[PDB]
Write a protein that binds this ligand. Structure first.
Ligand SMILES: *[C@@H]1O[C@H](CO)[C@@H](O[C@@H]2O[C@H](CO)[C@@H](O[C@@H]3O[C@H](CO[C@H]4O[C@H](CO)[C@@H](O)[C@H](O)[C@@H]4O)[C@@H](O)[C@H](O[C@H]4O[C@H](CO)[C@@H](O)[C@H](O)[C@@H]4O)[C@@H]3O)[C@H](O)[C@H]2NC(C)=O)[C@H](O)[C@H]1NC(C)=O
Ligand SMILES: *[C@@H]1O[C@H](CO)[C@@H](O[C@@H]2O[C@H](CO)[C@@H](O[C@@H]3O[C@H](CO[C@H]4O[C@H](CO)[C@@H](O)[C@H](O)[C@@H]4O)[C@@H](O)[C@H](O[C@H]4O[C@H](CO)[C@@H](O)[C@H](O)[C@@H]4O)[C@@H]3O)[C@H](O)[C@H]2NC(C)=O)[C@H](O)[C@H]1NC(C)=O
Ligand SMILES: *[C@@H]1O[C@H](CO)[C@@H](O[C@@H]2O[C@H](CO)[C@@H](O[C@@H]3O[C@H](CO[C@H]4O[C@H](CO)[C@@H](O)[C@H](O)[C@@H]4O)[C@@H](O)[C@H](O[C@H]4O[C@H](CO)[C@@H](O)[C@H](O)[C@@H]4O)[C@@H]3O)[C@H](O)[C@H]2NC(C)=O)[C@H](O)[C@H]1NC(C)=O
Ligand SMILES: *[C@@H]1O[C@H](CO)[C@@H](O[C@@H]2O[C@H](CO)[C@@H](O[C@@H]3O[C@H](CO[C@H]4O[C@H](CO)[C@@H](O)[C@H](O)[C@@H]4O)[C@@H](O)[C@H](O[C@H]4O[C@H](CO)[C@@H](O)[C@H](O)[C@@H]4O)[C@@H]3O)[C@H](O)[C@H]2NC(C)=O)[C@H](O)[C@H]1NC(C)=O
Ligand SMILES: *[C@@H]1O[C@H](CO)[C@@H](O[C@@H]2O[C@H](CO)[C@@H](O[C@@H]3O[C@H](CO)[C@@H](O)[C@H](O)[C@@H]3O)[C@H](O)[C@H]2NC(C)=O)[C@H](O)[C@H]1NC(C)=O
Ligand SMILES: *[C@@H]1O[C@H](CO)[C@@H](O[C@@H]2O[C@H](CO)[C@@H](O)[C@H](O)[C@H]2NC(C)=O)[C@H](O)[C@H]1NC(C)=O
Ligand SMILES: CCCc1nc2c(N)nc3ccccc3c2s1
Ligand SMILES: CCCc1nc2c(N)nc3ccccc3c2s1
Ligand SMILES: *[C@@H]1O[C@H](CO)[C@@H](O)[C@H](O)[C@H]1NC(C)=O
Ligand SMILES: *[C@@H]1O[C@H](CO)[C@@H](O)[C@H](O)[C@H]1NC(C)=O
Ligand SMILES: *[C@@H]1O[C@H](CO)[C@@H](O)[C@H](O)[C@H]1NC(C)=O
Ligand SMILES: *[C@@H]1O[C@H](CO)[C@@H](O)[C@H](O)[C@H]1NC(C)=O
Ligand SMILES: *[C@@H]1O[C@H](CO)[C@@H](O)[C@H](O)[C@H]1NC(C)=O
Ligand SMILES: *[C@@H]1O[C@H](CO)[C@@H](O)[C@H](O)[C@H]1NC(C)=O
Lengths: 747, 746
């Protein structure tokens, strides 16, 4: 039978299915099993029956906004390798866990007592996550770790105790440890004996102990007087394998060089949210880190201080392996050439992160002198013209996304000037720069008329982001100096397009021989001056969303009838959010014959002429989601041989015509979800020549469940080739007796 | 029995009800019937037969998407005065219209032929609207106007022919004409005999004839060469009563002063979208308008020309009665004191409009030397730091809305600097200005830290609009120099608020003795430094929408639970668009006790503690719309004696608890629309006292039309005083036979 309620594909995915009990309906060879997000309020020896090969179970957030597991529920398994209990409001570690477990996550529970009766028999444990049980203003109790609880686990590699009230590094920790997470534990003092016996440690996280609480975006309790963490100079002595060390928000004003004496493999050092300005300026510790790749010094600013310049010690010149340097929230006015002199001969330093410094001015010519910089991140500054709340599985101190969009960075050397003040680009702005492939000028409040001379000193820009400005496109030669331009993002430039009475000029689009992708979204374009057509021989993708094609294509106006025809290479066109009630036949027929993909979604369409699809022989995806459409042609096979994906969700369709679904041979993905369908006839499904369809989305329709759905329910069993996602969401709305029942639950 | 399908109140509003045809169910006392925006295809002599009392009928836009009207269909109606048929795709003026008609609207149809058989029989016509039949790129025919068609309408005071192709003014127009609209008619030439007989004309609209087509946001056909309209020197001679004249977009280059020799009453003169820069500079015609109140000179710019200065003729000093001058779209770089000299002795000139000129700099002291300027409109320029597509019923050339928001302007002198470049306000920025009550700094890209000195030169601002900037609130004394400040709008300053690691200070709010209305909307406020509370002893209304209260009030954080409690005078509070799935009990309890009106609408709320309304004895309106709420209490009368309006629309409410409609004695308006209610049973109706509800909104609920709905239908008949609106939209879901039908119809 069709897999229900789980999607099996060997893993079974039951997540977020509103299950009130563990499924007895589970498969046979099911191994990975995810029950997360369901409503299960009870667990037992009965609920899991017994099964075969299960190598994993995810019980997370059962139920959803606790859980009762009786002593010895998971008991007879012996196969159970990994078990995830997060967010179930557990007052205690469940008594009677299996001996098989190598992975256990108790994260985000009420467990205040870690005891031998819950743990010490777990000898096979590899990774154990106890994080986020007692923290912030949560009413909770100090965490008691029984003496030698972890001592019994001689295979233990990772241990995470973070965001719990500890006060001391637990003693008698197994020497097999690789990674140890102590973050935000209220530990004031680290002694010589705390970490002494762990010679295999590659990671130690002490962050958030004695935090720097000024301007905290969370409840923050400092050590007495706002004191630094106290780490004995021999604390790290036997730590020879250490790679990652997280000292963030330890309130450090001084860093003992002797900490790093026995730590030759050190790679990533996190010093964020401390008071390190002095140490950054002088910094004996910098001499001790020859293999260090990533150094994060972010948010060390002196409160209320705004110095003219940043003070970097010459000892930075001794990190020979340095790859990225993060200095955010240092807070200084100006970056001069000599200030970065110690970084310039570092062979591997490809990334400098200057975000959120309120920097007014920079001598850009310094970046040239650097050995090889790939990413120059200046976002969120003052640069002006040249003259539960926290993801427990994520880094708490800084975001992990790429600094620069990967699609932009792949082109080459990237300069990100976003969220600054450069409101006018003057003739010398970009002089003395490296050869910039990827440039981000977004959110500079730029109101200027780009004339074609502005980027001439960096003529090689491949990918240009001008989004969220005020640009006034009054010149046909704008941006044409960039010959190699490939991607251009003009989004959120609506300021001038909105005013009927100012001139508007898009003609520059045609000059580029390499332009591939162009984003005109959210510009409110309803009118252009003298040239109504967009023309490019190169252009591949055009994003036109958030404009007014309802105005451009108004029935009484023929000037814009051809607006997209001149893009002769175009395979992808996004027409969404143009407030279209209908598209004039002529206008639709004037869309490029080359189109493989067309998005009309989230308009007001009450009419669509299906016949017109005959003029688009390469059309693959047609996206009509989020409109008002009632009508479906019964003829589709006559208008397209190429259609693959058809997305109709969030429309008004109450009727599938006889011979609709299966008569298009090329159709794979059909999306009927969130429509008005009361049923599906035997006539809708035929099938003379078999359907290539691999996916059919029916969820969120008011199916009337009587014997009239019998044929569809029959069709589903006869085609298991066709998957209908979210079976738990394909639901009888009628009659009153069957309400809420899944369509496959009907007998 | 309540009225249906119409809402009778005597007029019937039947509009937008999806009617297939004229209802028979309309009351006989009914005078005016509005059938606009329905699905009715066919009008015949039996359509309105049951109604002889009809005076005014609105058939506009039927069907919604042609309309077939038989000959003499409306004939049997002896009392019909006003007949509005617009957007009906009518091929002809309907035959045999009743002679009683005073007002006829044929706007926006396919009628290309104006004939005696349709028009000339109606002697009582006052207003006749023919506009927008053949225009733009529409496929349409040139308009044939039969010689003498209007000659027989001796009562006709208004004729609108605009947006048709006339090619010349119709001869033989009646002398009763007051207003004549000829806009966009393709009339090249106005002769001396075109208007010679209209001695009662108050308004003449000649606009859009020989239009200026450069950068037009509509299909535009210029006269050959782009020539000016040709108006004979004597064309206006008998027009002595004219008040309004619209010459916009006639491609005028010179204006013949002689045209105005005979019109001593001229009040409003529209010259927009012409070639008039030369005239604006010399301008003999200004000698001729001592009674002109309103002069629109907008968009006379020379294409491609960005002169340093605007050049205003000294003859502007001859307009003694001028109230408002509109100079948009002249396009010049710098405004100097000397440039406005001729305007400065004009006693009544309250409004100056400089919008969309790309002005770089203004010598601001010039505005004082004017007699009295109430409104200085500088919006949409380059000012930097100091060193239906077309609604046929509206004005085509400019918007008619007030330049300044009336709520601001009412405080006093207004300066609107919005949509400019003043990104940093310097010490002298506002020097030598008049005493400014109403100030708009919106969308200036301002990133500065307001420190408390920036407004020192205009300390009397009572309404300040700071919206749509980059403002960095890093200083506790910000804005405190304005001690009379009543209204402060901070909307859309999110730039810095969204960065967790920069300091944020809202403490300045408390200083104001007179602060009434503060709008913090759409700032994405999730974190503050030090002071976590908003405090004011004055503030009446706080708009907090579009922030993150969901983060501020997060269960693990105690810091913001008092956030609004220190606003002691607070009555209206808007919590909408905060992504709230629920409000902690103590945080709700910490809302100001004085609230009359509380909006939590358009959040994610899954939960509401109704018992908490006990602490709000003044609470009148509670707006819960657009949430997830399932629950309502059966005890509500225990928790409030004060609740008047309760808005529950767009939630999931499966059932009403027992006697809910009779529960609260203060409750007048209850909104249950757009919910999951399948029935209202005997229980919701069961209680000792009676419903005092004057309104109950049920529309959009999936009602079950089986017999058990009958009980609620009796409750309806019992109380006719309880208004349930949109009854065509209160609709049976189950079962299939009754589906699509109003529950009132079963
Ligand atoms: C102090 O500084 C140290 C740095 O030394 C930080 O240590 C890191 O902590 C983060 C956050 O917990 C870790 O990130 C997480 O890693 C998990 C493990 O992944 C490893 O193994 C898997 C195999 O399953 C690989 O896929 C992966 O590449 C790694 O090899 C991931 O499971 C986590 O994934 C997260 O996102 C994905 C979605 O993209 C989800 O599927 C997950 O559920 C989860 O949300 C996450 O990436 C990181 O590994 C730690 N570093 C090291 C070297 O171990 C501390 O976090 C920091 N302390 C504080 C308080 O900030
Ligand atoms: C202006 O308009 C352009 C539109 O072109 C936008 O830029 C594009 O942004 C879209 C995101 O909407 C990008 O498309 C996405 O790329 C992701 C990254 O792919 C890279 O890496 C993967 C492997 O990890 C490679 O397969 C790929 O070749 C790239 O190297 C994909 O992961 C995304 O997939 C998502 O949708 C697909 C289906 O399409 C699913 O299969 C995925 O599960 C996932 O949901 C997606 O394809 C696109 O790359 C961007 N183009 C450019 C030129 O940058 C701008 O964002 C827009 N500006 C604004 C302000 O909105
Ligand atoms: C050339 O220049 C002249 C100015 O001299 C313009 O003439 C004006 O044209 C506009 C647009 O038609 C007229 O505005 C409309 O007036 C209607 C009549 O209002 C009278 O009656 C009402 C109530 O009885 C009074 O309140 C009012 O004072 C008048 O006595 C209104 O009904 C119209 O309102 C419409 O829109 C509004 C707002 O959307 C709605 O509230 C209404 O329901 C309705 O839909 C509208 O206000 C104006 O009256 C004309 N001026 C004069 C003095 O007569 C020309 O328009 C201009 N030419 C072009 C082509 O732009
Ligand atoms: C930041 O927040 C502020 C404060 O809320 C917003 O400013 C308010 O905006 C609202 C509308 O959004 C204004 O309310 C409206 O006022 C109109 C003016 O009414 C005056 O004049 C009429 C008669 O001429 C009198 O009846 C009245 O007492 C006033 O003297 C009303 O006409 C409006 O009423 C209509 O709509 C409302 C529903 O909104 C109904 O209640 C009415 O029955 C009627 O249908 C409306 O009440 C309010 O006056 C503004 N306050 C101030 C101080 O200006 C800002 O807009 C906001 N900023 C941003 C960017 O959003
Ligand atoms: C300060 O200046 C700004 C910018 O000019 C003013 O904002 C503008 O206000 C008008 C009038 O409210 C807005 O137009 C309106 O749109 C609404 C929303 O649909 C519509 O119902 C009205 O018919 C009206 O046309 C306009 O959008 C808005 N412009 C921008 C860019 O926001 C603001 O009013 C000024 N402040 C004061 C105190 O006057
Ligand atoms: C240029 O900089 C802007 C602003 O920093 C980047 O915009 C961010 O993009 C990511 C991905 O879309 C989002 O998570 C953020 O919401 C955006 N920030 C804001 C506030 O707009 C943009 O991605 C950058 N462009 C390139 C080419 O990397
Ligand atoms: C408003 C009339 C037509 C005009 N459009 C523009 C524009 N888009 N940018 C400018 C920049 C500088 C100077 C003038 C202009 C003008 S003048
Ligand atoms: C990032 C550390 C804390 C800071 N917050 C701000 C702020 N809101 N505005 C500034 C304006 C100028 C200079 C410095 C600042 C800083 S420094
Ligand atoms: C720099 O990195 C490269 C690999 O990217 C490596 O071969 C080289 O040894 C590194 N240089 C230093 C000094 O670490
Ligand atoms: C574009 O700008 C340059 C520099 O101002 C100017 O020389 C050129 O004439 C402009 N081109 C257009 C289309 O006006
Ligand atoms: C059309 O698009 C493809 C994909 O970008 C590209 O290979 C080809 O060069 C383009 N053709 C032209 C003429 O630009
Ligand atoms: C605010 O800025 C002013 C500058 O005039 C300064 O004097 C004051 O100290 C600042 N206030 C605070 C408390 O930050
Ligand atoms: C409280 O509100 C009213 C609003 O009209 C106002 O009259 C009164 O002065 C305010 N009280 C204080 C102390 O500001
Ligand atoms: C409502 O809030 C108060 C807490 O102050 C409590 O007495 C009552 O139980 C709450 N109701 C619910 C359902 O939580």
């Amino acid at each position: 039978s069709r897999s229900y309620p789980c999607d099996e594909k060997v893993i079974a995915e039951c997540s977020n299915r509103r299950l009130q009990e563990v499924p007895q309906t589970v498969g046979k060879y099911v191994t990975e099993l995810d029950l997360s997000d369901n409503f299960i309020t009870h667990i037992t020896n009965e609920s899991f029956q017994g099964l075969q090969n299960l190598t994993k179970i995810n019980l997370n957030h059962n139920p959803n906004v606790g859980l009762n597991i009786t002593d010895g529920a998971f008991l007879n398994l012996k196969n159970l390798r990994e078990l995830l209990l997060e967010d179930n409001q557990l007052p205690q570690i469940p008594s009677g866990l299996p001996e098989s477990l190598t992975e256990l996550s108790l994260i985000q529970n009420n467990i205040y007592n870690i005891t031998k009766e819950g743990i010490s028999r777990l000898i096979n444990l590899k990774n154990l996550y106890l994080a986020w049980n007692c923290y912030f203003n949560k009413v909770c109790e100090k965490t008691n770790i029984e003496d030698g609880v972890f001592e019994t686990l001689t295979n233990l590699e990772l241990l995470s105790l973070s965001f719990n009230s500890l006060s001391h590094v637990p003693p008698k920790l197994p020497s097999s440890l690789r990674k140890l997470f102590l973050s935000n534990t209220q530990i004031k003092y680290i002694s010589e004996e705390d970490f002494k016996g762990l010679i295999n440690l590659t990671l130690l996280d002490l962050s958030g102990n004695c935090p720097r609480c000024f301007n905290a975006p969370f409840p923050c309790v400092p050590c007495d007087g706002g004191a630094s963490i106290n780490i004995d100079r021999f604390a790290f002595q036997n730590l020879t394998q250490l790679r990652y060390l997280n000292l963030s928000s330890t309130s450090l004003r001084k860093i003992n060089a002797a900490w790093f004496k026995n730590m030759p493999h050190l790679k990533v050092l996190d010093l964020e949210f401390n008071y390190l300005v002095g140490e950054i300026a002088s910094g004996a510790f910098l001499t001790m880190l020859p293999r260090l790749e990533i150094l994060d010094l972010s948010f060390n600013y002196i409160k209320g201080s705004y110095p003219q310049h940043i003070n970097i010690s010459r000892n930075f010149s001794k990190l020979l392996s340095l790859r990225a340097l993060h200095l955010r929230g240092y807070v200084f006015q100006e970056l001069r050439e000599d200030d970065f002199q110690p970084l310039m001969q570092l062979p591997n330093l490809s990334t400098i992160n200057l975000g959120i410094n309120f920097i007014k001015q920079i001598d850009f010519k310094l970046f040239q002198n650097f050995s090889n910089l790939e990413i120059i991140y200046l976002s969120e500054n003052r640069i002006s013209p040249l003259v539960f709340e926290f993801d427990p599985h994520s880094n708490f101190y800084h975001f992990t996304r790429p600094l620069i969009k990967p699609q932009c960075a792949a082109y080459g050397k990237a300069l990100d000037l976003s969220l600054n003040s450069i409101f006018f680009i003057g003739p010398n702005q970009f002089e003395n720069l490296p050869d910039i492939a990827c440039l981000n000028l977004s959110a500079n409040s730029n109101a200027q008329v780009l004339s074609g001379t502005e980027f001439s000193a960096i003529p090689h820009v491949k990918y240009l982001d001008l989004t969220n400005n005020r640009l006034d496109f009054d010149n046909a030669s704008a941006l044409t100096e960039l010959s190699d331009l490939e991607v251009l993002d003009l989004s959120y430039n609506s300021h001038y397009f909105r005013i009927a009475g100012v001139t508007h000029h898009l003609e520059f689009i045609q000059n580029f021989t390499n332009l591939k992708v162009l984003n005109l979204s959210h510009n409110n374009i309803y009118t252009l001056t003298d040239k109504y057509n967009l023309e490019s021989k190169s252009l591949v993708e055009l994003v036109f969303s958030g404009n007014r094609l309802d105005i451009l294509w108004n029935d009484d106006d023929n000037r814009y009838i051809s607006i997209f025809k001149g893009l002769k290479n175009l395979t992808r066109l996004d027409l969404s959010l143009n407030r279209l009630k209908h598209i004039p036949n002529e206008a639709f027929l004037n869309l490029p014959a080359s189109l493989t993909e067309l998005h009309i979604n989230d308009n007001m369409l009450k009419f669509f002429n299906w016949t017109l699809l005959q003029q688009f022989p390469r059309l693959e995806l047609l996206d009509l989601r989020g409109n008002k459409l009632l009508f479906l042609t019964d003829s589709l096979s006559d208008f397209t041989s190429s259609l693959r994906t058809l997305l109709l969700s969030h429309n008004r369709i109450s009727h599938l015509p006889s011979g609709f679904l299966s008569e298009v041979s090329s159709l794979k993905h059909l999306d009927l979800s969130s429509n008005l369908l009361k049923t599906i006839n035997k006539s809708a499904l035929e099938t003379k020549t078999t359907t290539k369809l691999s996916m059919l989305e029916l969820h969120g329709n008011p199916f009337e469940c009587t014997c009239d759905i019998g044929d569809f329910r029959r069709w589903m069993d006869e085609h298991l080739n066709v998957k209908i996602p979210r079976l738990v969401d394909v639901i009888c709305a009628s009659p009153g007796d069957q309400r809420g029942k899944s369509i496959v639950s009907l007998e």
